[PDB]
Amino acid sequence: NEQIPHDKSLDNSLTLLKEGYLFIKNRTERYNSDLFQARLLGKNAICMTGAEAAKVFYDTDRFQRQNALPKRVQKSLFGVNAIQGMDGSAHIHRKMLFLSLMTPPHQKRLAELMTEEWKAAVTRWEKADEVVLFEEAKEILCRVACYWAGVPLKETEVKERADDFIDMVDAFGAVGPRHWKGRRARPRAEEWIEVMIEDARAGLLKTTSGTALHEMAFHTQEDGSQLDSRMAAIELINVLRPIVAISYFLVFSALALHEHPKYKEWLRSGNSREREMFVQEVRRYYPFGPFLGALVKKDFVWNNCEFKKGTSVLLDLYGTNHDPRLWDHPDEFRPERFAEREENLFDMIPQGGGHAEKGHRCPGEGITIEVMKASLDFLVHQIEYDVPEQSLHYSLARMPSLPESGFVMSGIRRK
Amino acid sequence: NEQIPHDKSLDNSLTLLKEGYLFIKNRTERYNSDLFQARLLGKNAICMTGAEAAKVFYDTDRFQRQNALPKRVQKSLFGVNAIQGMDGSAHIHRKMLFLSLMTPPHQKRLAELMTEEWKAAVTRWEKADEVVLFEEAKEILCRVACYWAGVPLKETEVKERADDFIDMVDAFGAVGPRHWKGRRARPRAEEWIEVMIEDARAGLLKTTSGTALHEMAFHTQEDGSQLDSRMAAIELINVLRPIVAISYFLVFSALALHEHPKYKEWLRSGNSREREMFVQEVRRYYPFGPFLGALVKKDFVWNNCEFKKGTSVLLDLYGTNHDPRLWDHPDEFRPERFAEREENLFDMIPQGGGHAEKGHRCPGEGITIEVMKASLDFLVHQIEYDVPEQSLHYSLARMPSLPESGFVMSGIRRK
Amino acid sequence: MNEQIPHDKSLDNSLTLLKEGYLFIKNRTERYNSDLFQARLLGKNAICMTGAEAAKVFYDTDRFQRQNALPKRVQKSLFGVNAIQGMDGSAHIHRKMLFLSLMTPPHQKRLAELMTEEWKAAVTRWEKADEVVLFEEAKEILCRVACYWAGVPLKETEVKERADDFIDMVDAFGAVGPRHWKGRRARPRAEEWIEVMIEDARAGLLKTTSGTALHEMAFHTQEDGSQLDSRMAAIELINVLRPIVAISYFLVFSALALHEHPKYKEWLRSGNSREREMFVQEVRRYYPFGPFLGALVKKDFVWNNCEFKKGTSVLLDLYGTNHDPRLWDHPDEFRPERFAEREENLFDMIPQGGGHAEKGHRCPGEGITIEVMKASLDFLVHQIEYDVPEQSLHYSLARMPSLPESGFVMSGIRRK
Amino acid sequence: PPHQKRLAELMTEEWKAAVTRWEKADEVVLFEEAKEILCRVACYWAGVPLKETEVKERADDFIDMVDAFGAVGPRHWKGRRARPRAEEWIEVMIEDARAGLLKT
Ligand code: HEM
Ligand code: HEM
Numbered sequence A, B: 001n002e003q004i005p006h007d008k009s010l011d012n013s014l015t016l017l018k019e020g021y022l023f024i025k026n027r028t029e030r031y032n033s034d035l036f037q038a039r040l041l042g043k044n045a046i047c048m049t050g051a052e053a054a055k056v057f058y059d060t061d062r063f064q065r066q067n068a069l070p071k072r073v074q075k076s077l078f079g080v081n082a083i084q085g086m087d088g089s090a091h092i093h094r095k096m097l098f099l100s101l102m103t104p105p106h107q108k109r110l111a112e113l114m115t116e117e118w119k120a121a122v123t124r125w126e127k128a129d130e131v132v133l134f135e136e137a138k139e140i141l142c143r144v145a146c147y148w149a150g151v152p153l154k155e156t157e158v159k160e161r162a163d164d165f166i167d168m169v170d171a172f173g174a175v176g177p178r179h180w181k182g183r184r185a186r187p188r189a190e191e192w193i194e195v196m197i198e199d200a201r202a203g204l205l206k207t208t209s210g211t212a213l214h215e216m217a218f219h220t221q222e223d224g225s226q227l228d229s230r231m232a233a234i235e236l237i238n239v240l241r242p243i244v245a246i247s248y249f250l251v252f253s254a255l256a257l258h259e260h261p262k263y264k265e266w267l268r269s270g271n272s273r274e275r276e277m278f279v280q281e282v283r284r285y286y287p288f289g290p291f292l293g294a295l296v297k298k299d300f301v302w303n304n305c306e307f308k309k310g311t312s313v314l315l316d317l318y319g320t321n322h323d324p325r326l327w328d329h330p331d332e333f334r335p336e337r338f339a340e341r342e343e344n345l346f347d348m349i350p351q352g353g354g355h356a357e358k359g360h361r362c363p364g365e366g367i368t369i370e371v372m373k374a375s376l377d378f379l380v381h382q383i384e385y386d387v388p389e390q391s392l393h394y395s396l397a398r399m400p401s402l403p404e405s406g407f408v409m410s411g412i413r414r415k
Numbered sequence C: 001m002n003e004q005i006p007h008d009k010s011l012d013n014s015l016t017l018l019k020e021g022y023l024f025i026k027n028r029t030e031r032y033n034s035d036l037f038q039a040r041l042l043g044k045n046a047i048c049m050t051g052a053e054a055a056k057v058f059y060d061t062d063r064f065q066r067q068n069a070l071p072k073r074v075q076k077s078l079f080g081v082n083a084i085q086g087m088d089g090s091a092h093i094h095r096k097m098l099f100l101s102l103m104t105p106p107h108q109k110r111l112a113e114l115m116t117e118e119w120k121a122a123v124t125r126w127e128k129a130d131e132v133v134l135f136e137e138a139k140e141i142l143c144r145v146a147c148y149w150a151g152v153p154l155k156e157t158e159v160k161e162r163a164d165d166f167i168d169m170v171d172a173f174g175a176v177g178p179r180h181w182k183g184r185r186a187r188p189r190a191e192e193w194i195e196v197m198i199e200d201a202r203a204g205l206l207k208t209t210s211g212t213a214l215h216e217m218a219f220h221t222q223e224d225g226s227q228l229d230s231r232m233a234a235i236e237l238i239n240v241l242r243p244i245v246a247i248s249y250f251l252v253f254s255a256l257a258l259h260e261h262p263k264y265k266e267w268l269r270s271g272n273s274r275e276r277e278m279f280v281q282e283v284r285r286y287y288p289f290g291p292f293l294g295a296l297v298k299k300d301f302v303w304n305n306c307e308f309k310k311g312t313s314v315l316l317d318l319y320g321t322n323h324d325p326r327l328w329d330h331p332d333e334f335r336p337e338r339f340a341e342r343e344e345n346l347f348d349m350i351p352q353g354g355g356h357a358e359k360g361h362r363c364p365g366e367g368i369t370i371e372v373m374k375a376s377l378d379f380l381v382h383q384i385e386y387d388v389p390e391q392s393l394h395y396s397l398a399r400m401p402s403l404p405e406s407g408f409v410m411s412g413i414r415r416k
Numbered sequence D: 001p002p003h004q005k006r007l008a009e010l011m012t013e014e015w016k017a018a019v020t021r022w023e024k025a026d027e028v029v030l031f032e033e034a035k036e037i038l039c040r041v042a043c044y045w046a047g048v049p050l051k052e053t054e055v056k057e058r059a060d061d062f063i064d065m066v067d068a069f070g071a072v073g074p075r076h077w078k079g080r081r082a083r084p085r086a087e088e089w090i091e092v093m094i095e096d097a098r099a100g101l102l103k104t
């Protein structure tokens, strides 16, 4: 009873597990429409793609994030009742706290700490037979994130803290044991950080003004009250965990360098401009965030479709980032496409669209870019290495997707 | 005043632990009364026995089940706040859900799956030195129950899941370590099944209409709302666990065939009619459910006893099944006593009395009988085996009870 | 307001309290020449005091309350959540009478005698062992005796685990990091273990005996006649079992005192119960255990030219008061003879609290602690001879609680 | 007879001391108490050092050898595994005693 296409399959959630990052795109292509209806994740939903749909998706008067996604994502990736599900001035108030910790001075400090760690790892890498970049990245990022945040990290817990952080990320689009590893990792990380929050509030743990642990421990909401120690820990996890999740992008950028070697000498000849272009294309080209979920706040009409209050809407991030209407040859890795490109908040949304200060767009975008640029500079200039025979293939069905090998490296030598 | 027999001892709960299935009958015999007063399980109680008392016990205007038993039974056998403690229209509404899953077609299906599994196990049994029927029964029943319910069950977890189910059953009448194993097994099973409920509601787990997992996940109460995912998991476990608990009756059936071999050829020359009589006598003769607890809902007088509102009342299941006024030679195993016998809902109550549709009587009675008939048919026609030297003794003080050896078999060969 | 009252203005005072421990308050009362100073401690603006006169005001229940006084960390490790230590008013007195009813002189005598038989039985094994750690031996014996006297079943294969969980809770009350987390994990294990007992008892499924701690906690009724929650009843029973095991600290300090002051061995041997009580009291006064106590100002009042505002945190220095030269001549010296002909006072000797135990929060186990210490000291003096080999007997005044590092390891043990 | 008397008197002291522990226990298995007491008494009388944290495992190893002499299968294999552990544990004592590094 509508001109809006309707997928009437009742197993669509299971097909989403089968198709992953291509579920919405396969159907927007099939139905010749930027939007279609489908029962997904237990809700009658509308899936939409494209920059114009992203513009509507980020209209906070038309869309809310509360109760948008199933509880399984909060219990694994986000944390229960955290910022991802907040709306109104309360969300903006808490969003300002996250943004205050991810300013360019923070981005520069984090990238510089990573540069030091990469250079120091060379002396052990030269003595190893093989090195898995994903494993080295997750442990370096965990060590750097905690140090930069004032979070104590003993050397005997680095691997278990980093694995717990990655287990949460690796579980957001999974069922069965991969999803359960994140469900068990989250309570350990929350208990671990909440103790620091309580010790800090009693003065029994030294904190430093301007760092994430201190600002989370002593942040006050709009009513002047502090966050519950568990919520303060959860929101600190929403800083430490995604910094470790940069490991995925670091492996993808290394895979892109390997699969497209002409950009290797192109990066050496250039400077930070060419590294940023490469890093932006890594974020646009490779999969990470599949889609975003929202609920319709008030009845409205857009693109000849009636959005009723309460219906779930999913915005295809991967499809928008591979839209031929916005990107020429979208399925090709071409860093040159970002040369002299005007800033657009809705055609490139691997970490969200719109304004971070007025919406749910990722505030760690700058940190992600600067850490990637520094890690790319290290791979290009500091060391030479072989990429031995391995399964470099990554599955689009799997969410999040990662090359099975993890970019194993051998024959590592300093330049 | 009452002037009804009164056991004035203060350690009666400890005496119930040492006398078990005979505690109520020892005192009804001693007091020459169908009922007596006593302080049991921390409550001033009245124990009663006989079919007439069973008729009164199942008057839902006179009796309720809410708050009738200590919390220890919920936290081990039943689950907290499940069907066993419900009253009124809400209980009948949930009771219809269970009954819809245990109709004769379900009984036939479960019995047929059991036959197929028994026959396949012969190849393994012929190669083994000894086989413990109890351990084989619980694992087969667990795999058959989960497959029939639509509950996924990996081969690497069949033993643990079946052990967790049996631990809950083996703990309902225990104190100390035996009871604690059921207190620890219950949260494991609830968490295991609850994940399935939430995954099914999100469409991420395939379910099939008419199976237990589906019907529990999408059952709606009187107000049209579905159960909490934990409640739905608890009530699904109230289907899976008692199916595994049939292992007790299967072991007792083999013990009856061994201790009274005159019935082996009697069953051989007979058919389903003789298997019914044998299976029914196994349920009447051997102990399983000791007694049932209820609370007096309103003041009433029965058998010259004034039942005050709120007092605890225990109905002797075991003693009623061995009542010489209802069964000739009640302490003898005589399957022929069920030859062309009319339906009586209160003289034979090993799995409750009254109407299962209008009360708390076990809805799995038909499933239990049909699975027992199939397993008995298998032991009689399909294999020959030795019963080596073992302790086949079972204690009437241990609740639940089981032959100590578990009817270990050897020399197994197909026929 | 209180600009005259001295004021430590450091922002890291909670961290300095961790590194100074039992000496944090005395260092500043000596520094400021005052029984009173202000400081931000444990996340609250506080006033620290010391001396017998300060203790008198601290135990004025109209001026001070215990609810919300300490951080929740102490409840989650030592006390238990919402237990007797944080209660005020008639409800506190009611539950306090329950504890006192289990720690009367008949209970003190029973526990002390149970200790004596266990010490004597241990000699047979001690003679066959190369070395014996008194701290490890005490906590096991104290746990076995406390559970037996309380009616708490204790399997032989769980004695070490239960005793370790009790000490983990005690050893964590003044710590941060791993040492504190051990108590944070031990408490749920102990609470769950005891709560099943409370549930089985209330159902008649576990035998209890009137007059024993397990029975009295399981069937204690509040002012409104209702029973405690099964979890709360277990928590308060642990507030009896655990502190009995905690006597292991005092037992090691007593043996440390005999070794470090050998002249009192013959003094005790040539004496009787009088000299043992004097030695035991001096062990409690001289050695550290209870650092300070916390309370909230119940209502506005003025004392010692200081304005106490309702809600402000106040910490009473137990250690410093016990070493106050105004009350004890040569206070930093172990002199058991100082307790001969000592007038009984409720505010100058406060290692386990001050005031009246029946009208305040003073430790009701003081009598049990003394009687068990006397019997243990009697055994160490008359029953056995032993060597104290080379070991680290040092105990840090910054570590809360404190213990000689070795735990007074003994060797060459033989009967007398 | 002097060695017999000494071992019996050591046993007597151990039985008497055990009563304090037995009075607080719900149950006591005589076989398990006898094997541990005998192991401690035998080692002490022999001059063999025996830490309290190893009494159970040393006594278990001793009984495993005895309980295996007329058995086949797992019961016999327990003794076949306990013997190398006990032989190695005692040969180190012989080694140290002959070097004067263990008091005898
Ligand atoms: C590895 C690279 C990253 C990717 C692909 C990514 C992606 C995303 C996506 C898709 C969202 C949801 C956006 C929305 O709802 O509109 C998000 C939100 C968020 N991200 Fe990231 N992110 C990354 C790195 C980071 C880092 C390193 C941090 C922390 C320093 C971070 C912090 C956050 C926070 C706090 C939010 C919630 C923002 C809010 O709800 O207002 N992210 N991110
Ligand atoms: C092994 C044989 C079994 C025995 C001895 C047994 C016995 C009992 C007893 C004594 C009750 C309590 C009756 C009452 O309160 O009046 C009961 C209830 C119940 N049984 Fe069974 N049962 C058996 C098998 C099963 C099986 C195989 C299932 C599931 C397929 C099952 C499902 C239930 C349920 C759902 C209830 C609760 C009914 C209600 O409260 O309305 N039982 N059973």
Ligand code: HEM
Binding pocket: C084, C085, C086, C096, C099, C239, C240, C241, C243, C244, C245, C246, C247, C250, C289, C290, C293, C351, C352, C353, C354, C360, C361, C362, C363, C364, C365, C366, C368, C369
């Ligand atoms: C025999 C073992 C012990 C038992 C059963 C015991 C019991 C208790 C109880 C029940 C309380 C709470 C009283 C209240 O809040 O009203 C308490 C408080 C206290 N106990 Fe003990 N105790 C024992 C040994 C000790 C020892 C050896 C010390 C030495 C450090 C000690 C020091 C304290 C302190 C400082 C308080 C707090 C006093 C206050 O808040 O005013 N106790 N004890």
Ligand SMILES: CCCCCCCCCCCCCCCC(=O)O
Binding pocket: A016, A017, A073, A077, A169, A172, A173, A174, A241, A242, A245, A288, A289, A290, A291, A292
């Ligand atoms: C099939 C399950 C449904 C899929 C749920 C998708 C969850 C949307 C959020 C994805 C954000 C990307 C995560 C990057 C790492 C981080 O920021 O923690």
Ligand SMILES: CCCCCCCCCCCCCCCC(=O)O
Binding pocket: B069, B073, B077, B169, B172, B173, B174, B241, B242, B243, B245, B288, B289, B290, B291, B292, B399
């Ligand atoms: C300590 C006294 C016992 C407490 C009262 C026991 C009441 C429960 C009786 C239920 C018998 C049937 C249990 C087997 C089937 C199942 O798994 O549910």
Ligand SMILES: CCCCCCCCCCCCCCCC(=O)O
Binding pocket: C074, C078, C170, C173, C174, C175, C242, C243, C244, C246, C289, C290, C291, C292, C293, C400
């Ligand atoms: C940050 C320092 C903690 C504050 C001090 C908390 C209470 C100190 C006094 C209690 C000492 C009692 C310890 C032995 C008895 C017991 O086990 O309760």
